[PDB]
Design a protein around this ligand. Structure first.
Ligand code: JLG
Ligand code: JLG
Ligand code: JLG
Length: 284
């Protein structure tokens, strides 16, 4: 079926939970043996969220190459994404090592450091220009260059220096700051505006490594971001945009990381975002 009318049909029939459970039943199951080794317990935020072995990002290190991060490679759309958990106190250096080694231009953060009164990720970037961060375990230096605070999101320019080689690179940090503590946003307008700002920066383009996107576990909000982006790109590429099947795209992405889209409300929100976004693209 088309998307917008499939949407009204699920709303009128109140069957979002059944649609979402079908996706969960059909989703791929691949091994995640490296994630479960005892030496990696303090590298995982949640015991039930792990990268598959076949798609995990490897650190270029001979001691321990493990990070909780997955490469989502979308062949028809010609887009790749790295989805990862929010960094932990003992993985902030690994996080920036990955950014460097994978040649990423942008980092997309969809959570706040504290939500619901608890810590959801480490404070892994500097908050003042004159107070830079040094990660001694991976030999990197990170400096805040500038910060632009808007009503729904903040963009930061960061400098990452490989202290071994003295090479430097500019990284863009896109921080969506207004996702509610519970549920999903009422309108997708600010989330789509944010997605378009990431796109306009070059951070999603083939001349760079894959964008790094995270929330707390790296599957829920993060899954919503890449699902909406890929569906909208396919609608622009194909002769028949109404052939884009969001459920089929989601199952393809779940071949590369488990659990993408965590609730039926997140599924409904993803449909809403793609539907509204397709009107603004045109040719709109
Ligand atoms: O939460 C933490 O532990 C944390 C946040 S930034 C950081 C480091 C910066 C530079 C070296 S360690 N640690
Ligand atoms: O909508 C089209 O034009 C369409 C439907 S499927 C499709 C392709 C799949 C893989 C490569 S092109 N294009
Ligand atoms: O099937 C639809 O309603 C749909 C989704 S995107 C699309 C486009 C039309 C013209 C350009 S893109 N139509």
């Amino acid at each position: 079926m088309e998307m917008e009318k499939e949407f009204e049909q699920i709303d009128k029939s109140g069957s979002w939970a059944a649609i979402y459970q079908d996706i969960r039943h059909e989703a791929s199951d691949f091994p995640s043996r490296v994630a479960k080794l005892p030496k990696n317990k303090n590298r995982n935020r949640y015991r039930d969220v792990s990268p598959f072995d076949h798609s995990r990002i490897k650190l270029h290190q001979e001691d321990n190459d493990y990070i909780n991060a997955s490469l989502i490679k979308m062949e028809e759309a010609q887009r790749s994404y790295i989805l990862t958990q929010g960094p932990l106190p003992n993985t902030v250096g690994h996080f920036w090592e990955m950014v460097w080694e994978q040649k990423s231009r942008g980092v997309v953060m969809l959570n706040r450091v504290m939500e619901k009164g608890s810590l959801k990720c480490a404070q892994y970037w500097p908050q003042k220009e004159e107070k830079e961060m040094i990660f001694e375990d991976t030999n990197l230096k990170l400096t805040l260059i500038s910060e632009d605070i808007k009503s729904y999101y903040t963009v930061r320019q960061l400098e990452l220096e490989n202290l071994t080689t003295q090479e430097t690179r500019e990284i863009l940090h896109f921080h969506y700051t207004t996702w509610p503590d519970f549920g999903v946003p009422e309108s997708p307008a600010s989330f789509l505006n944010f997605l378009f700002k990431v796109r306009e920066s070059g951070s999603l383009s083939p001349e760079h490594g894959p964008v790094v996107v995270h929330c707390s576990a790296g599957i829920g909000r993060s899954g919503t971001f890449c699902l909406a982006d890929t569906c909208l790109l396919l609608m622009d590429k194909r002769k028949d945009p109404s052939s884009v099947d969001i459920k089929k795209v989601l199952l393809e992405m779940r071949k590369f990381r488990m659990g993408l889209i965590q609730t039926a409300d997140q599924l409904r929100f993803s449909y809403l975002a793609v539907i509204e976004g397709a009107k603004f693209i045109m040719g709109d």
